[PDB]
């Protein structure tokens, strides 16, 4: 019901042939997106029936560079706006596109945007964007409530159905009428279901309500406590104490999260705190992107010695082509022989030609995947020219997908128990353009590579 979004703003897909498959794997049967909804580079006849269950997005929605004619998001109710596209916008529809390109937005359920604005630019075939009252969709306390709508078109749009009270519509159909819940309120209530004073919603309900109580509204402004909209989750110091996870109160933190003494589920321990394994709580070597190497994007010869004699890295490991050309040497890679856990992802887009495998990570056991490359991948291997993997001690992939493509000499890809490594019904192995299996449980040749 809860899934993690992606962060690949306006970027080309890592694997063009598996983009739709990765989207389907990430968003199949998901109601709440904990991140950004990025639907980009969709062909004309793409089937997007897996997005029909999405109801809430924590970050921002980005629909760009799509040849689809319709994107079926008709149950989405609220966008939190925790993250913003270009630091200003919560919804972005850019450069989309029968000639092709989306023709209607069809967001008849969207009612509330907590933080951010709307950006709609360069959509030749899009219609019914200037007739939507965007002030109604913005929360009354929204600070960055700005709109930038480009209405340039290459076609003429029919008027929507006369069933609408005004001319505000999300499409041509009669059920694409826009519902107003802010500008029709009686008195000072931010949300309402009608023009009467008794039709206002509870103060803790965000996107609208069905009744005046705090248990019968479409969304929770701050937190959902077993169907009750509450400003704060119940404190732990307490048999009724609950942990904070997104916008809901939970009994226990999820599988790949850290429980803080404050009472929230986070992905990294705070300052002056140490992770303790019992589940793990917040009661050391730092990788790329963790407070010392935040701007560093590769493991070069100027920082490889920081990982010497380490057993757990609080970060990621990226091996770009620039890492090996002072250029890195194969003899320097042995500093990772003692590595056993990676908190982030493992990215390898380059490798020495004298190494027939990834044996320098022989003792690596867990890739936590709390930080994902492009927001979706925790293990990527492309253009390596390796004969076999050799990750003998790997047992768990905490989060994210595994992408192994364009390795023309790689065998033993399917001889690995990948399903045993995953701990979520959202992870999968995407592999293309490898050595054909016709010409090709273990990790490599020999008796020592058995799983």
């Amino acid at each position: 019901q809860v899934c993690t979004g992606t962060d690949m703003k306006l970027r080309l897909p890592a694997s063009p042939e598996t983009h739709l498959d990765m989207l389907r794997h990430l968003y199949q049967g998901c109601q709440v997106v904990q991140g950004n909804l990025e639907l980009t580079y969709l062909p004309t006849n793409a089937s997007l029936s897996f997005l029909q269950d999405i109801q809430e997005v924590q970050g921002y929605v980005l629909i760009a560079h799509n040849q689809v004619r319709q994107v079926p998001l008709q149950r989405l109710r609220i966008v939190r706006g925790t993250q913003l596209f270009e630091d200003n916008y919560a919804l972005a529809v850019l450069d989309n596109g029968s000639p092709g390109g989306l023709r209607e937005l069809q967001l008849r359920s969207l009612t509330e945007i907590l933080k951010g604005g709307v950006l709609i630019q360069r959509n030749p075939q899009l219609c019914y964007q200037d007739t939507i009252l965007w002030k109604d969709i913005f929360h009354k306390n929204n600070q960055l409530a700005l709109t930038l709508i480009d209405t340039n078109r290459s076609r003429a749009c029919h008027p929507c159905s006369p069933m609408c009270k005004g001319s505000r519509c999300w499409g041509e159909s009669s059920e694409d009428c826009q519902s107003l819940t802010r500008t029709v309120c009686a008195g000072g209530c931010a949300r309402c279901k009608g023009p009467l004073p008794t039709d206002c919603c509870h103060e803790q309900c965000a996107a609208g309500c069905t009744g005046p109580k705090h248990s019968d509204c479409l969304a929770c402004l701050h937190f959902n406590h077993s169907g009750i909209c509450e400003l704060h989750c119940p404190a732990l110091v307490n048999p009724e104490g609950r942990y904070t996870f997104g916008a809901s109160c939970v009994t226990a933190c999820p599988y790949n999260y850290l429980s803080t003494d404050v009472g929230s589920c986070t992905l990294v321990c705070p300052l002056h705190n140490q992770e303790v394994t019992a589940t793990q709580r917040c009661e050391v070597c730092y990788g790329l992107g963790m407070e010392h190497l935040r701007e560093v994007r590769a493991v070069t010869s100027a920082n490889i010695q920081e990982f010497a004699g380490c057993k757990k890295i609080f970060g990621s490991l990226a091996f770009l082509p620039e890492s090996f050309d002072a250029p890195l040497q194969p003899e320097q890679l042995q500093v990772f022989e003692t590595l056993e856990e990676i908190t982030g992802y493992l990215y390898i887009s380059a490798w020495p030609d004298s190494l027939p495998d990834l044996s320098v990570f022989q003792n690596l056991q867990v890739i936590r995947g709390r930080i994902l490359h492009n927001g979706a991948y925790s293990l990527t291997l492309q253009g390596l020219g390796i004969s076999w993997l050799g990750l003998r001690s790997l047992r768990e992939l905490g989060s994210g997908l595994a992408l192994i493509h364009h390795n023309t000499h790689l065998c033993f890809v399917h001889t690995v128990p990948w399903d045993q490594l995953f701990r979520n019904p959202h992870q999968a192995l995407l592999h293309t353009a490898n050595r054909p299996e016709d010409e090709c449980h273990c990790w490599g040749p020999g008796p020592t590579q058995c799983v």
Partner: nanobody
Amino acid sequence: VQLVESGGGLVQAGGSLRLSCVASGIPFSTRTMAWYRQPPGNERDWVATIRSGAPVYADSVKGRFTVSRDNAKNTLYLQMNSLEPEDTATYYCWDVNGDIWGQGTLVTV
């Protein structure tokens, strides 16, 4: 760092064509090159990939296309034979390791 594709144009059904991709400013010898095609209104489709030995071909173009490279000239070739009306697409040159895309060339059958 840039990639330039050339050698496209027009051809009849059942004809032949040869494509060329040139790299300037990158170590072409230690890079993996991939060919792609983009039919109008669709997504980019993989064609072939070669690093140092026998290239890997897609099931659609297997047996009709041959891919070779010249490290001294920093060029990558794509020989096309027995062309079909379904082969009309914009062909792209991709550097897998460096993540560098070419501008593309138009091929119409």
